[PDB]
Design a binder for this molecule. Structure first.
Ligand code: SF4
Ligand code: SF4
Lengths: 328, 278, 327, 302
């Protein structure tokens, strides 16, 4: 029943060692618990938005799926094959299907290479027997698809206006005909009108090629437009997971109520009249998360049971929460 | 298109100091090459009619004579061969050792980076001129020992800057994107990291050659250095410093070529710094 | 009407022009800018990169780069601010005018205890003793909702999160009780909850101290909270000016329409965002006449001339040639 | 606290590695008395064999050398007859110390002064003269500056003496001190300028200006500490550069300091005196760089 399950993630953890100069040389490293206890499944033809404050680990979660950072525990599976135990070579079979778009427009592109080479580098790496003519024609066709003029082929990435650089990044991801593309803050650096060009383009390409996306962003309002489901994160935990109607119109988790009421609205008669929720105290350091529930220091409805045990995602496909004191 | 090394070429040609320098440095190379071959006199020859004389255009001793009755024009050229060949050889050794240590320290990540950069800071606290003098006095002044000894003590800042550049590139996005594009570790090094590390290497190599010419010329001013049949500019300067009361040209000609040469490389290095890293 | 808003002003800026002497030729980053402001008002200067909005703030403060040149006028309580010598401009810079900046991480001095970074304002401008300056700094940190203010005074700013560093900046800027606060993108570096706190704080402190605010941002969503008058800018030129309500509900200039459609929303569902086409503007080789010409859906041959900054409905400015009823 | 301890636990084995390589480098060298050539004058060998057991196993001869250093004894010279190495250090160390300390203080004072006066007055004649002189001093070597100062002031003008110290009177110290320091006045000025310009354009100096502070208070309280930290980091190399440059300066002007003593040892193949002074100058540099990095960690609050 339903669409194909494309990617499954269960009990994923990413702990980084940290040994800062404030420790004695004798002492063990501390653990930066960047991600701890994410659990979800992503379907074919679906966009999952991942959203949260700085330090939520959404960028490390992205990097753990595609293999740029080694997961400490859990399982990730693509089309039924496990990813986290894989040898360095068999990752190439999976990366034919899984590709990525990155935070910084200029940094994403090698500054010593032309556009034609940057978009051709995946294609040349996966099809070594393909001719220089076929590679140039594939690249010109993909440039015309992302909205770059074909005669720009021989120009270098410093000649481009930042929004054009994320179009090169999209073209490089799509040249293989992938099935999941992961977007690590694809529109953070860009001007507001250009953000809407890149988001409309990703949403067109999803519909035109049949992709799934994992879309990671800081702006809740951008995430609502492109996503079908949203994962809300706090200090490496999954706090809420549901469809784009439920997570924004019926938020149950206290952090999502705070985050969605803190989102600013582009209407003077609404922004001055909304019921603002406010959180007591700073973001805890991810070098020493609180024991039990990690939101326990900021939560408006806290209680002593939340120090004794740690919540996990419970609920339906439509909506699920990690809280002891609310139930959908 | 705006090929970034052709913009660097345009910046280098616009910097008039740097082009001027390169002309000068090539004219010094042509003097150091040709003068012993075009000369009427040899490096080991003597004319006791002119035991020590100032420049005289009818004599053919155009730079005057050393107090053994011996020609300074030929000796300043032959000594320029030694100082430039030791300087370039020592720079090659320091560039290879420094690039290898810096690239491994930067690419292998935190574990190895931590200890390898600790060793540079510790080692930079040794008296390397005393340590090269200790090698040279205990093992006997061979020119091949001086190439290697000057190089093996002067790669530390070269390794520090190549480490900084390599660790920055290993953190950059287009290396993560090359891994996601299925590119092998050898492909990432050869086609993505090396072309971007190469800028720092060319700038610091060009700035390092004059320090090696100075280190040799110091080590040969005290004595030590290279012996009489293979005397460098620093060895001529000490015979000059003694002779200075009677025949001051024995400082001024060696000093002119050495100072000019060191000036030249400094402006070529700053021209490349400006060109490759605005 | 604007004839009245020119007369009762705290600040009245006429033909402000900012030009940078870059090697590619003179770049006019702000171009004949005109506006005025009164005690308790907020002006939201709004636009993307290349709009020049950040240079307007620095031109009023005299904080431009070395290669910058300022022309025009800025009348303030009957004095004139622009091109004053530093020894006289320093008499305005915290006692009457004040500023907060885009990056809270690098704006505080990392080599000094935060309490002295506050106290140096009061000891210079209000002639306080070091004893009075400490207690007034503590009262201002409490007004700014800083926790355990006395303990925080002895900290260096690397002990603090980016949200607390903007609180220190606001406490430091407002310490003298200014007439005007200028705010260059204060929340762009910060999370959504810290943004909602700092905008709620400024909206309360505006009412207690009776400051005017110039709020500079790309986020129309943040403008809608603090703002009373909006000033839309593109390529250094005024595109629209008027009441915040008016500009947000009846935007009369095509770029204002495109930007308020490109800004995403929670309140209603839809198929696509109605984005403005084309690349962001370059100030070198910017097109003559209207700067929005290579992007505009309503472009006409007359737009090769510069459009006049006319008024249509009393209290607004239009900067466009299309008839006002055809949008 | 923890930083002081970390520096000490790195400095101690650093000096022990330097002693260990330098001893085995003497003990395995050609012509070295330990190999048994015994070509030295009998009166010198009678002094060597009284402090070194020339027949003992290689390891035993290394531990007996560490024993001598632990009691502060460097052992006998392998060429001088009546002079101990400690005697030769004692007669030459104050001559190096007075010239080196004068050249170092002059390099810091004139260098930081010129560099601040080049970061202020950024694109005026005052920068173009200071960065002109800071090119000239780095590029013209100390062994070219020193003979030219003798030529101008002792041979041509007769204003100052070219010879060695009559007991350290200022007229004999002034040319050595200028010749030794110019290469470092220039280098300090360059580092100070570059640091001070990066500071004067910083967002914290922009915020100091935005408070309306007078430029006197912006320089002295806000800018000067962050500007001089890169100069303090440079005090390590500057120390090495001045003890290094002392070899050419003491040799040209004829000063009986540790640089002349080391060079005369190295020309004469006195392995003991050359080994000795390398361990001494190494220990002084390892200690001084620890003191500099500790002072940096006390001034910097990060
Ligand atoms: S589990 Fe407890 S502390 Fe955590 S969000 Fe729910 S109510 Fe708050
Ligand atoms: S003046 Fe012309 S180009 Fe400019 S916004 Fe109006 S219609 Fe468009």
């Amino acid at each position: 029943e339903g669409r194909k399950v494309l990617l499954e993630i269960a009990d994923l953890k990413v702990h980084f060692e940290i040994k800062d100069g404030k420790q004695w040389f004798w002492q063990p490293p501390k653990t930066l618990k960047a991600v701890d206890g994410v659990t979800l499944r992503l379907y074919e033809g679906e966009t999952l938005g991942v959203v949260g404050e700085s330090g939520c680990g959404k960028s490390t979660f992205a990097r753990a799926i595609i293999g740029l950072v080694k997961a400490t525990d859990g399982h990730v599976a693509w089309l039924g094959k496990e990813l986290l135990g894989m040898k360095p070579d068999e990752w190439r079979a999976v990366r034919s299907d899984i590709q990525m778009i990155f935070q910084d427009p200029l940094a994403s592109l090698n500054p010593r290479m032309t556009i034609g080479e940057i978009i051709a580098e995946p294609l040349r790496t996966y099809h070594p027997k393909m001719s220089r003519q076929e590679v140039r024609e594939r690249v010109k066709a993909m440039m015309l698809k992302v909205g770059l003029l074909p005669n720009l082929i021989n120009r270098y990435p410093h000649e481009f206006s930042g929004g054009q650089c994320q179009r090169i990044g999209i073209a490089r991801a799509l040249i293989l005909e992938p099935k999941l593309i992961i977007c690590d803050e694809p529109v953070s650096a860009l001007d507001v009108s250009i953000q809407a060009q890149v988001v409309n383009l990703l949403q067109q390409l999803q519909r035109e090629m049949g992709l799934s996306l994992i879309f990671i962003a800081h702006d809740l309002a951008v995430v609502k437009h492109i996503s079908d489901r949203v994962l809300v994160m706090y200090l490496g935990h999954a706090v809420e997971l549901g469809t784009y109607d439920e997570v924004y119109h019926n938020p149950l988790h206290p952090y999502t109520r705070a985050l969605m009421s803190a989102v600013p609205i582009p209407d003077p008669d609404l922004e001055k009249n909304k019921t603002i929720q406010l959180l007591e105290g700073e973001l805890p350091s991810p070098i020493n998360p609180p024991s039990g529930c990690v939101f326990r220091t900021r939560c408006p409805i806290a209680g002593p049971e939340c120090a004794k045990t740690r919540p996990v995602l419970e609920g339906s496909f439509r909506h699920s929460v990690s809280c002891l004191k609310v139930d959908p | 298109g705006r090929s970034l090394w052709q913009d660097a070429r345009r910046r280098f040609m616009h910097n008039r100091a740097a082009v001027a320098s390169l002309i000068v440095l090539v004219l010094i190379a042509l003097f150091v090459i040709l003068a012993p071959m075009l000369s009427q006199f040899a490096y080991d020859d003597t004319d006791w009619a002119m035991m020590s004389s100032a420049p005289d255009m009818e004599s053919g001793h155009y730079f005057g004579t050393d107090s053994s009755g011996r020609d300074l024009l030929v000796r300043v050229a032959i000594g320029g061969r030694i100082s430039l060949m030791v300087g370039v050889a020592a720079a090659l050794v320091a560039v290879v050792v420094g690039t290898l240590y810096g690239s491994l320290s930067g690419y292998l990540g935190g574990k190895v980076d931590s200890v390898m950069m600790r060793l540079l800071e510790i080692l930079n606290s040794f008296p390397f001129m005393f340590f090269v003098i200790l090698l040279v006095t205990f093992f006997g002044q061979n020119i091949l020992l001086i190439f290697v000894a000057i190089g093996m003590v002067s790669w530390l800042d070269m390794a520090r800057i190549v480490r900084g550049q390599t660790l920055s590139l290993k953190r950059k996005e287009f290396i993560e994107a090359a891994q996601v594009g299925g590119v092998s570790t050898s492909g990432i090094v050869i086609r993505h990291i090396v072309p971007n590390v190469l800028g720092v290497v060319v700038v610091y190599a060009s700035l390092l050659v004059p320090s090696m010419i100075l280190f040799e010329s110091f080590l040969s001013f005290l004595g030590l250095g290279t012996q009489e049949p293979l005397s460098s500019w620093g060895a001529l300067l000490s015979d000059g410093a003694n002779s200075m009361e009677v025949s001051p040209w024995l400082l001024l000609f060696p000093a002119g070529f050495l100072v000019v040469t060191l000036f030249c490389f400094n402006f070529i290095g700053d021209g490349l710094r400006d060109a490759l890293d605005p | 009407p604007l004839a009245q808003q020119q007369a009762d002003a705290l600040l009245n800026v006429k033909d402000l022009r900012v030009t940078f002497s870059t090697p590619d030729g003179d770049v006019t980053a702000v171009n004949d800018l005109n506006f005025s402001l009164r005690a308790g008002e907020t002006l939201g200067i709004v636009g993307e990169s290349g709009s020049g909005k950040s240079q307007t703030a620095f031109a009023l403060m005299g904080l431009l780069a070395a290669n910058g040149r300022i022309g025009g006028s800025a009348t303030f309580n009957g004095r004139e601010i622009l091109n004053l010598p530093e020894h006289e401009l320093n008499k305005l810079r915290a006692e009457q005018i004040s500023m907060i900046f885009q990056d809270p991480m690098t704006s505080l001095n990392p080599y000094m205890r935060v309490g002295e970074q506050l106290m140096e304002v009061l000891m210079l401008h209000k002639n306080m003793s070091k004893a009075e300056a400490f207690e007034e700094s503590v009262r201002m940190l409490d007004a700014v909702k800083m926790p355990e203010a006395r303990k925080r005074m002895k900290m260096y700013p690397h002990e603090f999160s980016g949200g607390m560093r903007q609180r220190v900046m606001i406490a430091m800027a407002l310490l003298c009780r200014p007439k005007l606060l200028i705010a260059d993108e204060p929340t762009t570096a910060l999370d959504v909850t810290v943004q909602a706190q700092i905008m709620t704080l400024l909206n309360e402190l505006k009412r207690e101290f009776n400051t005017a605010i110039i709020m500079i941002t790309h986020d129309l969503v943040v403008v809608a909270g603090i703002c009373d008058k909006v000033l839309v800018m593109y390529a250094g030129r005024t595109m629209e000016y008027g009441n915040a309500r008016d500009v947000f509900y009846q935007p009369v200039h095509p770029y204002s329409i495109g930007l308020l459609n490109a800004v995403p929303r929670l309140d209603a569902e839809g198929e696509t965002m109605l984005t403005i086409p084309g690349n962001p503007p370059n100030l070198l080789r910017l097109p003559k006449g209207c700067p929005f010409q290579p992007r505009c859906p309503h472009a006409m041959e007359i737009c090769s001339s510069a459009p006049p900054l006319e008024e249509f409905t009393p209290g607004r400015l239009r900067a466009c040639f299309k008839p006002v009823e055809e949008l | 606290l923890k930083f002081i301890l970390r520096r000490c636990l790195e400095a101690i084995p650093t000096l022990f590695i330097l002693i260990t390589i330098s001893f085995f480098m003497m003990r395995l060298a050609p012509g070295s008395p330990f190999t048994g050539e015994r070509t030295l004058p009998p009166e010198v060998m009678a002094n060597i064999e009284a402090k070194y057991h020339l027949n003992d196993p290689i390891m035993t001869q290394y531990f007996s050398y560490l024993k001598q250093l632990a009691h502060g004894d460097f052992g006998p010279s392998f060429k001088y007859k009546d002079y101990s190495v400690n005697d030769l250090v004692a007669s030459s160390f104050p001559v190096s110390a007075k010239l080196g300390a004068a050249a170092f203080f002059l390099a810091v004072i004139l260098g930081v002064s010129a560099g601040v006066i080049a970061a202020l007055k950024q694109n005026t004649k005052w920068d173009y003269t200071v960065m002109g002189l800071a090119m000239t001093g780095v590029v013209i070597p100390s062994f070219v500056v020193a003979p030219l100062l003798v030529m101008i002031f002792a041979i041509i003008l007769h204003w100052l003496p070219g010879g060695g110290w009559n007991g350290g009177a200022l007229k004999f110290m002034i040319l050595p001190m200028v010749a030794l320091s110019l290469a470092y006045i220039a280098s300090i000025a360059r580092i100070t300028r570059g640091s001070m310009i990066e500071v004067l354009h910083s967002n914290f100096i922009r915020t100091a200006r935005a408070k309306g502070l007078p430029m006197r208070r912006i320089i002295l309280r806000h800018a000067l500490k962050p500007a001089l930290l890169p100069v303090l980091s440079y005090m390590g190399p500057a120390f090495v550069g001045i003890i290094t440059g002392s070899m050419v300066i003491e040799t040209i002007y004829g000063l009986p300091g540790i640089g002349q003593l080391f060079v005369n040892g190295a020309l004469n193949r006195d392995y003991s005196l050359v080994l000795s002074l390398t361990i001494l100058v190494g220990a002084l540099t390892i200690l001084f760089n620890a003191i500099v990095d500790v002072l940096y960690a006390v001034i910097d609050p990060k």
